[model samples]
Target: AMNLKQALIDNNSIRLGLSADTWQEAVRLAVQPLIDSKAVTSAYYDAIIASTEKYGPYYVLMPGMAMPHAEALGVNRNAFALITLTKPVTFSDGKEVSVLLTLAATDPSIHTTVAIPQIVALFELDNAIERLVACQSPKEVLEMVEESKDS
Candidate 1:
């Protein structure tokens, strides 16, 4: 819950987007909001690209979800991005996922601690996912995230 607050404290880091198709397009749509919000540095894109190279489909499929993450050092700042597709998109992992989380950290250490759990928690909800997929606006999405923070 604290991480959710920490993640969205500044409107600068949070954004909502329409469905993005390709992996690069999905990443671009996801990361662009964070970049626009200044939640992360411009280097975040390169970091995600680098992560994709090091870890193929770092956006592992989780049932109906996919969490895309890179090492913390990829960002000039510590930040996260949340993107939900209107329609599911296929990944290299043979999973079609609609939920995408782009995490860019300021340092490398938090990957094992803070980042992974939050990433994992995003997929823990079995009941609320349908609601998440139906969210209409970024505020609505944030509300769902806030509700999930409590559950």
Candidate 2:
């Protein structure tokens, strides 16, 4: 089954209470785990920046939260990475964002079907950002996904 926590386990891309010097730096840090796991190419980061510039922050639901995704040409498979900043970073539009979930998927159609259900569920939870950002370990974050199964 395509579970968020299971995907995270496979990718080993879950991180908690991560510190980043800047917004770009945080995103840079966010994409590293995926690259190290061989899920995407080095060029994906630049694509993400350009995408963010052309469009506004993609799917930034609430304050202190945001998600990432760029071109599919660099992707190998559907992948997800969760990153938390110790201190909140400001986006270009002066928005608050500290939680980064970098998503790497093959194509838009496949991406929608396989990559985002649990992600949507997880974010719908009360205190979603608080629970995730304050998690002390990857296991705790997995439990957050666990709760989302029915939350």
Candidate 3:
């Protein structure tokens, strides 16, 4: 089973200072890496959009962060993608987000349960969103993940 940090590292799914005019575009860019890696099909993005439309962007997890995800729609494996916008974009709920984490899971149970803790651990770090966005290399991000896991 791949951990969240390891999966992100292996897939090369981290991007920083991405530019987007709208939150929808931001979500699209955030999930693009997972699609490119064949972790999830393009349908996953559509699913996320549908869910956001119906539920009102409830995935906005914090002041500067969002976690966009869908069901097991066309998921090839469990994976994660991280994107940091050059500027914040506003979601349907009127929250501004600069950091997006996209989740791709093959099933509803094992992957979800195994991945959530690691995600939580990382996000719980002090100024986590800021630190992540500041990372200039994948190695820096991986080092932060290691520290987060140790905590």
RMSD of each: 2.6, 1.7, 1.5
Clashes of each: 2, 0, 0
Please give, for residues 49-134, the per-residue lDDT of candidate 1 as tens digits. 77777777856646666555666643556666777777777766567767777766666667668776766665676655566677
Clashing pairs in 1: 12-37, 72-105
Candidate 2 clashes between residue pairs 3 or more apart in a chain or in different chains: none
Better of 2 and 3 by TM-score: 3
| Model 2 global lDDT (CA atoms, 0 to 1) | 0.80
1 or 2, greater by TM-score: 2
Q: After superposition, how far is residue 13 of candidate 1 from its true place, in Å?
A: 3.8
Each prediction's Cα lDDT score?
0.66, 0.80, 0.84
Better of 1 and 3 by lDDT: 3
Task: For candidate 2, write residues 1-151 as lDDT tens digits.
Answer: 3567877888998877778776788788888889889988878888888888898677565677777787665778778888888888887788888898888877776556766666778888998888888899998988888898883
Name model 3 segments beyond 4 Å from true.
110-112
By lDDT, the candidates rank as 3, 2, 1
